[PDB]
Amino acid sequence: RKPKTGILMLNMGGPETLGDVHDFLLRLFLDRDLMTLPIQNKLAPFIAKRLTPKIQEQYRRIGGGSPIKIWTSKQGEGMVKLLDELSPNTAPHKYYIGFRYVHPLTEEAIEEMERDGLERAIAFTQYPQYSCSTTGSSLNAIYRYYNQVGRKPTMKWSTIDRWPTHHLLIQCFADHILKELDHFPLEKRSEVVILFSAHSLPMSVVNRGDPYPQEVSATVQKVMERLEYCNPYRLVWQSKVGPMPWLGPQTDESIKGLCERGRKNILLVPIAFTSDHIETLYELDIEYSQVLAKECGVENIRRAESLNGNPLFSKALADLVHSHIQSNELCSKQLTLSCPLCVNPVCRETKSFFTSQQL
Ligand X SMILES: CC(C)(C)c1ccc(-c2nc3n(n2)C(=O)CC(CNc2ccc4ccccc4n2)=N3)cc1
Give me the residues that bind a copy of itself (CB under 8 A), please.
164-165, 193, 203, 206-209, 211, 213-215, 217-218, 220-221, 225, 229-236, 245, 247-250, 253-255, 257-258, 261, 263, 332-334, 336-342
DSSP H helical ranges for the chain: 21-30, 40-61, 68-86, 106-116, 137-149, 167-181, 203-206, 212-226, 251-260, 278, 293-295, 311-327, 345-355
Task: Give the Cα separation of 131 and 150 in Å (integer).
Answer: 27
Cβ-contact 301, 228 below 8 angstroms: no
The answer to whether residue 339 forms part of the interface with ligand FES (CB under 6 A) is: yes
344 in contact with ligand FES (CB under 6 A)? yes
The stretch among 78-86, 152-160, 198-206, 308-316 that binds ligand X (CB under 6 A) is 198-206
Q: How far apart are the first and last CA of the chain?
A: 23
User: How far lies 18's CA from each of 11, 22, 98, 134, 264, in Å?
Assistant: 19, 8, 20, 23, 36
268 touches ligand FES by CB under 6 A: no
The binding track of 121-150 with respect to ligand FES, each residue x by CB under 6 A or -, is: -----------x---x--------------
Q: Is 282 in the site for ligand X (CB under 6 A)?
A: no
Clarify whether 322 is annotated catalytic: no
Q: Is 33 a known active-site residue? A: no
**Is 241 among the residues that bind ligand X (CB under 6 A)?**
yes
What is the Cα–Cα distance from 126 to 72, expressed in whole angstroms? 9
Which position among 22, 93, 166, 277 bears the catalytic label? 166
Residue 241 burial (CB count, 10 A): 9
Q: Does 47 bind ligand FES (CB under 6 A)?
A: no
Residue with smaller CB distance to ligand X, 201 or 317: 201
CB 206 to a copy of itself: min, Å: 7
Mask for 245-274, x = binds ligand X (CB under 6 A): ---------------------------xx-
**Distance of alpha carbon 27 from alpha carbon 101, whole angstroms:** 5
3-state SS assignment for residue 122: strand
Which chain residues interact with ligand FES by CB under 6 A? Answer: 132, 136, 338-339, 342, 344, 347
Active site residues: 166, 319
